[PDB]
Design a protein around this ligand. Sequence first.
Ligand code: APC
Ligand code: APC
Ligand code: MG
Ligand code: MG
Ligand code: MG
Ligand code: MG
Length: 345
Amino acid sequence: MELQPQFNEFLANIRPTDTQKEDWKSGARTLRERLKNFEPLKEIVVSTFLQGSIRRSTAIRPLGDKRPDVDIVVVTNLDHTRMSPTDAMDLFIPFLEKYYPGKWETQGRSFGITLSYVELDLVITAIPESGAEKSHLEQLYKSESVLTVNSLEEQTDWRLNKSWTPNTVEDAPASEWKAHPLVLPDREKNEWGRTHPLAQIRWTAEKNRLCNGHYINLVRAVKWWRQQNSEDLPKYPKGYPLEHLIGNALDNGTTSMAQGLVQLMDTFLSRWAAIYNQKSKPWLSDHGVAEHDVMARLTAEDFCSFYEGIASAAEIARNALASEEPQESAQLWRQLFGSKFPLPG
Ligand SMILES: Nc1ncnc2c1ncn2[C@@H]1O[C@H](COP(=O)(O)CP(=O)(O)OP(=O)(O)O)[C@@H](O)[C@H]1O
Ligand SMILES: Nc1ncnc2c1ncn2[C@@H]1O[C@H](COP(=O)(O)CP(=O)(O)OP(=O)(O)O)[C@@H](O)[C@H]1O
Ligand SMILES: [Mg+2]
Ligand SMILES: [Mg+2]
Ligand SMILES: [Mg+2]
Ligand SMILES: [Mg+2]
């Protein structure tokens, strides 16, 4: 059985809490305003915006006491050919000491800021374009479409368009943004790399519409499966490479979460069968920066162990979907997801 009310309750159980949500919305607004009014950075900071799994509504609630990771981009107008990633980051130390003393730390390519209930993950970026192109991009980064702190789940009317306004317009033509990534610090060395968070967000919103609202829920459900079965799965993939694998495997047109789960798992297994039999791993283009392999740091051994995990899970998911009794079907789904998936009343 599909058990759509049970899937809805399960999703409500694995979303971050309202306490966490209001903490990160207020934290993002406060950081943005403080940066806006900080005199040494006023002419440098273009935009401060929410990104990552939190923005795309693909984050799951942390277990126990833990604070969710909440990703923030600071867009600057710095010349990345004349200043290194650390030059740009150096600019923000006085600001952090003034407004977040004792609550911030450098974490390699980003700054961690400990709030009451969440952990901000701040990345400093720059716009590589110049002239009029740069001005047009800065206008996009200053628009409500970028500055909204509501997540995709809260505004299905969201589009990547400097003219979009919250409903109390489509995505802009791709030629205005698709080939225009930001630069950010590389993970382990003082060099600029490319990232296109806006394009990832837009791609996710569109995939979610193409899949009738089930995509971001399916991402969170599969993350929860991976967490619940972590003892039997490889450490990687997780986080964004896992999300990207799910978005790849899922077909357009999803009609329920049970159907979508079985479909995406079946498709994963068929699409990567040759790669698995070659003891390899796929090369998968990032939706933001096409020439980037989202799987670049994943080992072939981990991909193949994960493939074995998906094969085992797909058998369970098929049985749960095919089951004609609500209790038996829910028991099989709970074999996948654990006790946060409820039994029907
Ligand atoms: N291998 C990768 N390829 C492309 N983009 C990536 C990426 N790793 C991270 N990113 C981008 O940077 C954002 C922040 O990354 P992370 O915080 O490390 C994982 P996340 O997607 O936010 O899930 P999580 O923090 O809830 O576990 C990601 O959401 C993604 O937009
Ligand atoms: N916090 C973040 N915010 C935005 N984009 C991020 C991000 N973390 C990672 N990304 C994106 O994911 C891509 C891959 O990032 P990582 O997995 O950390 C390897 P890297 O930084 O490219 O170093 P490497 O070339 O030495 O492997 C980055 O290029 C960036 O596009
Ligand atoms: Mg994150
Ligand atoms: Mg992070
Ligand atoms: Mg790299
Ligand atoms: Mg697909």
